[PDB]
Amino acid sequence: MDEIDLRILKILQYNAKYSLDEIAREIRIPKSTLSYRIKKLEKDGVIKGYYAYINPASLNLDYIVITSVKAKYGKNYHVELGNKLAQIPGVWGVYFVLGDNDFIVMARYKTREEFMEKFLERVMSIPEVERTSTQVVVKIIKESPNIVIF
Amino acid sequence: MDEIDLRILKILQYNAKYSLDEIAREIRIPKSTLSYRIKKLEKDGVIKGYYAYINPASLNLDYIVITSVKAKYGKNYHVELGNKLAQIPGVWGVYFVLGDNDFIVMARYKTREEFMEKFLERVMSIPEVERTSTQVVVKIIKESPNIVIF
Amino acid sequence: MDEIDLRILKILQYNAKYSLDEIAREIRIPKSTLSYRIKKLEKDGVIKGYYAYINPASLNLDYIVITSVKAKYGKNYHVELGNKLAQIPGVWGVYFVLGDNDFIVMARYKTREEFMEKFLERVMSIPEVERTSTQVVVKIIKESPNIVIF
Amino acid sequence: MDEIDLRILKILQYNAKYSLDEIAREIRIPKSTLSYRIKKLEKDGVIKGYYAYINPASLNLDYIVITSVKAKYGKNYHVELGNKLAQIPGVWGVYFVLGDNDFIVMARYKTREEFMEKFLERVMSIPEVERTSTQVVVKIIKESPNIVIF
Amino acid sequence: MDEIDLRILKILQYNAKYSLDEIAREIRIPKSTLSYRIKKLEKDGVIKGYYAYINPASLNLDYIVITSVKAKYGKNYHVELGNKLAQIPGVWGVYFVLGDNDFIVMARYKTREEFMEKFLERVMSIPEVERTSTQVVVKIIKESPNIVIF
Amino acid sequence: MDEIDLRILKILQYNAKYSLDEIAREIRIPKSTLSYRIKKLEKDGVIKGYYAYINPASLNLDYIVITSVKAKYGKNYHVELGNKLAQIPGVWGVYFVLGDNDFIVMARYKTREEFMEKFLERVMSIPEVERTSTQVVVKIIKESPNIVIF
Amino acid sequence: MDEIDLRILKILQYNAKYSLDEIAREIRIPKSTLSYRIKKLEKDGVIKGYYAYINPASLNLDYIVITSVKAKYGKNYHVELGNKLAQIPGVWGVYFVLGDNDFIVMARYKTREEFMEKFLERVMSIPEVERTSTQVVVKIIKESPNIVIF
Amino acid sequence: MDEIDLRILKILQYNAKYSLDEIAREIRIPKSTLSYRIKKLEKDGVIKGYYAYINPASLNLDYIVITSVKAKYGKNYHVELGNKLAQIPGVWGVYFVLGDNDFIVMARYKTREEFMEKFLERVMSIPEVERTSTQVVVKIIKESPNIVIF
Numbered sequence A, B, C, D, E, F, G, H: 001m002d003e004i005d006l007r008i009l010k011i012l013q014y015n016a017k018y019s020l021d022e023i024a025r026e027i028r029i030p031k032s033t034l035s036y037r038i039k040k041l042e043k044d045g046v047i048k049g050y051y052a053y054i055n056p057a058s059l060n061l062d063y064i065v066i067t068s069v070k071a072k073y074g075k076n077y078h079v080e081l082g083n084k085l086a087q088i089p090g091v092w093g094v095y096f097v098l099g100d101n102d103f104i105v106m107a108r109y110k111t112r113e114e115f116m117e118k119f120l121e122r123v124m125s126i127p128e129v130e131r132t133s134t135q136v137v138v139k140i141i142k143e144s145p146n147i148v149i150f
């Protein structure tokens, strides 16, 4: 990658539907060269895909949680427990962390009941779990994980 | 929205580049109807945009953090402190939460030094901050915020 | 329910002994209609009953506690442990909660000794309990659970 | 009070609408004597009133919280802060407690938004508040504060 | 007991060697009556004994600790664990408490090594112990447990 | 001090009323020598006094507490705050400690109300106090501070 | 640096007094080349100096502590507070850290009194300090900071 | 040891390469006497060795951690767990401590990955470990364990 690739990525992280002509006009480079650079970024794994940003509210995902998990330590518990947490419907983020907790889990549900049934009731039966503490999100001030270049 | 819209969104959340012909063939509906439904979803704000999923590793974003923030309480501190945290370069997520902490901040940096300079040194001067506790992410087990329909 | 039902309930939550004539005069509706609406609210389960508010002090219930419970996680522990806590004499409230604790228990006793014997000594033998932390209530500033309409 | 008064109260705490004839038949005492004893209990302040038990669900009170409050210490802060917390719409219980927190607050709201606006946004501006930690109630296992005699 | 007994006890809690003549002169009562009252207080168990207050420093007891204990819950653990803690040489106080810990232990030793050997190494092997947290006393501001009447 | 002094002190810490003849017979030394050694121990400050051990229960001291105090740091706060805590009626022990808290306070009261009025209400107004956490003693397993020689 | 430099450093980190002839014989290289490489490592700042490892016990440094510090946040508090902590006699390590605390301080003293006077009493007056928690080291299992190559 | 030995040690703790002539000139004593005193200090174990102070940065040791360990209590766990922690490559300090944790571990690694593999993955399999909390060092303000005489 170089300076040009970064300028292209800075645009694509926000609008993957911007036309080649418009991008070429903005960054000032041939459209053929632009297409070549983009294909190379995809081929090299820099661009792993293109997603539609869907408004969680439209799907009534109003029960947003950030759960901290304390594990029962054992050989390779981070991979085993991490994978069990990752396969729970509604869970989009699972992080192995340093601190008083071992994992931070990000999840979304429509209601308190769905959250209890799909998440809480599943987690309580996982053997590698010592206990968890769920922080309910009252307000999402910002959630733009797509922005990697500021 | 209806059952058809959900099937369309379930595909677009993963691959926004899938052709209309391929989607129409998969969900079994006219291409003209598909384009109409998609445009309506965009118009109604269900689909807020399309982003390229960039591999954070390609940008050397190896210093991943989840910071818990305790605020100095005051009238409307959640909005004021939330906005100050949201404008820090590298911060992609800011959540107002219930629990022993008031905000959870998600951020990415290339190094320990960049993290100290861009994030730590900025946060320590914000008047609404009482203190913070940063959990370093050793391993990202899963991070697919784009998936809203499981 | 409608606006009228709410006005009736707002009165009944405070004084269930208020005469039909007095209520009818206050909210301005026929006594026959009032009786009909009240019976329907009872039939529909909105009004589950009528209780006498007894002064806990008259019964010497001076040892008031709010106990936080950490559970030993397992399949359906919330229902099993919750029910074991609920059947302890003196316990009037049991809540399954989110946070560093799993249950919050509200109880009343006449003395420290009765509290130890009836509550502490029973809880310590429950297998689903990891540990508990009891907060002694020094002063009840307010306790009006009967008020559901402010 | 005596043994008879306790038997009367044990019934009234559950059903304040039970007829005098039925109560007299159950506890085995003259109806005239029963009415006299009941009036004396009311006069002496043992029975402070009669309330209708309304199903919180019927009022859509699905956002149930138990908030722990850490105060900024000062002369008589327990009374001053306690009273400010007690006047917040939706708050039915305020307890001055011993432990790592100073007050425990019980409240009910219909939604996350109402909770933020009516409770969170009011509490954050109270000068006597250092900070709070809210535990969201996922499931009410038991809530029968009316039972004072087990 | 009466007002006179309290005046006698208020003196004896400080100086058990004060002569009968001096006490009688101070509180203004016959020496014979004084001796009678004192003997009755001893007989009734109010006065359980007389001890010499020895300066801990003279015995080089410079390692003063207050240890909080978290227990592994079980039937009657408070009595069983309490008694095991009470028999450890150097331990003078063992309290079963409410809060995040279950016991508070007061102990004195001459050195860090003696403390580790006599206390730490014994406690770590007790099955009813989950863990402990020891607070080292840097300075004793006050320690007059003999004063029961202020 | 020597081996003989220790044997004398080991007896006096339990029974300061034991006669000279009985002590002399037990430890096997002349009564004149015993009296001389005892007087020297008093003169040298080893024996600071003699107290009557009064049963706290006889004085209805049923509200026993161990309060942890977090201070507002400042020059010499340990001495200033320590002395303010030490002069509160009912407080018999004040310890400056290492750990998450700065002082541990031992106190006794007859009731919850007396504890609130004499202790809680006084402590909340002390400027050097950040906050406190009170652990209520449910049961005193052991409290023999008089034993310095095991 | 290369493989040879690492082998030289692996020896020097343990014994800086080992003769050139002995080192040359061990790693198998000319003494002249060895001296050249060592001088270059010193010149390049890899080897910052040579110290005598003194047994702390010989200096009666028996009061070993690890203190966690919570700071009062402000612009550049990490540098300002860090430097104030670093200049305290007895303090050999000061670390700015991530977590519930902001600094970890390593210090050694001969006694409890010296620790209180030189460290505690100085730290309590530093304006940037909110509070501290000192962990007393009962036993040093290992302390070989000189080993950088395992 | 005496005053002269201390002056010699105060120099050697900083520069073990200072010539005998220079030291003798500085402290004002015969070179023969200086050599004798130094040899005696080594023989008596006061000076345990001489090490080269290597700049950790030169070895790319940028992942610096201070890990707190909670143990599963058992007979002699402090020695057994302490020794298991001490043998982990990268760990230079292991301290058995008083407080909410039982051990404090100091370690250095080149990267997050090396830290996870060499330290985290080894510690999670140790049976005596209940859990750990790692504090990442953002900045080393001071690290001069060689200074024992201030």
Ligand SMILES: NC(=O)CC[C@H](N)C(=O)O
Residues within 6 Å of the ligand: A021, A024, A029, A030, A031, A032, A033
């Ligand atoms: N510049 C454009 O947009 C198209 C022509 C350009 N020369 C190319 O190579 O694509």
Ligand SMILES: NC(=O)CC[C@H](N)C(=O)O
Residues within 6 Å of the ligand: A078, A097, A098, A099, A100, A101, A102, H067, H119, H120, H121, H123, H124, H132, H133, H134, H135
């Ligand atoms: N998994 C481990 O080995 C330790 C993880 C723990 N969260 C820590 O920070 O140390």
Ligand SMILES: NC(=O)CC[C@H](N)C(=O)O
Residues within 6 Å of the ligand: B021, B024, B029, B030, B031, B032, B033
């Ligand atoms: N089905 C297709 O893909 C194209 C023709 C279809 N009838 C339409 O309306 O678009």
Ligand SMILES: NC(=O)CC[C@H](N)C(=O)O
Residues within 6 Å of the ligand: B078, B097, B098, B099, B100, B101, B102, D067, D119, D120, D121, D123, D124, D132, D133, D134, D135
């Ligand atoms: N902002 C507030 O009013 C309180 C927020 C706090 N985190 C809580 O859970 O109560």
Ligand SMILES: NC(=O)CC[C@H](N)C(=O)O
Residues within 6 Å of the ligand: C021, C024, C029, C030, C031, C032, C033
């Ligand atoms: N209004 C009253 O109180 C009684 C008469 C009224 N018309 C009724 O239907 O009950």
Ligand SMILES: NC(=O)CC[C@H](N)C(=O)O
Residues within 6 Å of the ligand: A067, A119, A120, A121, A123, A124, A132, A133, A134, A135, C078, C097, C098, C099, C100, C101, C102
């Ligand atoms: N029961 C569970 O699955 C978790 C409950 C826990 N109190 C939490 O907040 O996460």
Ligand SMILES: NC(=O)CC[C@H](N)C(=O)O
Residues within 6 Å of the ligand: D021, D024, D029, D030, D031, D032, D033
């Ligand atoms: N017992 C009753 O119910 C009514 C008659 C009874 N003798 C009385 O005094 O009321």
Ligand SMILES: NC(=O)CC[C@H](N)C(=O)O
Residues within 6 Å of the ligand: D078, D097, D098, D099, D100, D101, D102, F067, F119, F120, F121, F123, F124, F132, F133, F134, F135
């Ligand atoms: N208000 C006070 O004085 C102290 C209250 C505090 N919650 C405690 O338990 O000590």
Ligand SMILES: NC(=O)CC[C@H](N)C(=O)O
Residues within 6 Å of the ligand: E021, E024, E029, E030, E031, E032, E033
């Ligand atoms: N008062 C005294 O001290 C001695 C005489 C007194 N009348 C008595 O009965 O003991």
Ligand SMILES: NC(=O)CC[C@H](N)C(=O)O
Residues within 6 Å of the ligand: C067, C119, C120, C121, C123, C124, C132, C133, C134, C135, E078, E097, E098, E099, E100, E101, E102
């Ligand atoms: N022993 C028990 O049952 C509970 C004791 C615990 N310390 C508490 O405060 O609840």
Ligand SMILES: NC(=O)CC[C@H](N)C(=O)O
Residues within 6 Å of the ligand: F021, F024, F029, F030, F031, F032, F033
């Ligand atoms: N031994 C006694 O009790 C009294 C006589 C003894 N010879 C003395 O000197 O006191």
Ligand SMILES: NC(=O)CC[C@H](N)C(=O)O
Residues within 6 Å of the ligand: F078, F097, F098, F099, F100, F101, F102, G067, G119, G120, G121, G123, G124, G132, G133, G134, G135
């Ligand atoms: N007073 C101080 O300087 C610090 C006291 C604090 N309790 C500690 O352990 O560090």
Ligand SMILES: NC(=O)CC[C@H](N)C(=O)O
Residues within 6 Å of the ligand: G021, G024, G029, G030, G031, G032, G033
């Ligand atoms: N090898 C030695 O120890 C000395 C001779 C060697 N040729 C040198 O250059 O130093």
Ligand SMILES: NC(=O)CC[C@H](N)C(=O)O
Residues within 6 Å of the ligand: B067, B119, B120, B121, B123, B124, B132, B133, B134, B135, G078, G097, G098, G099, G100, G101, G102
């Ligand atoms: N200094 C800061 O900005 C925050 C430091 C704090 N210890 C943390 O981990 O977040």
Ligand SMILES: NC(=O)CC[C@H](N)C(=O)O
Residues within 6 Å of the ligand: H021, H024, H029, H030, H031, H032, H033
């Ligand atoms: N003083 C020196 O440096 C050398 C001579 C001195 N008289 C000695 O004994 O070593």
Ligand SMILES: NC(=O)CC[C@H](N)C(=O)O
Residues within 6 Å of the ligand: E067, E119, E120, E121, E123, E124, E132, E133, E134, E135, H078, H097, H098, H099, H100, H101, H102
């Ligand atoms: N090992 C033990 O016995 C107790 C150690 C614990 N860290 C404490 O401070 O008490």
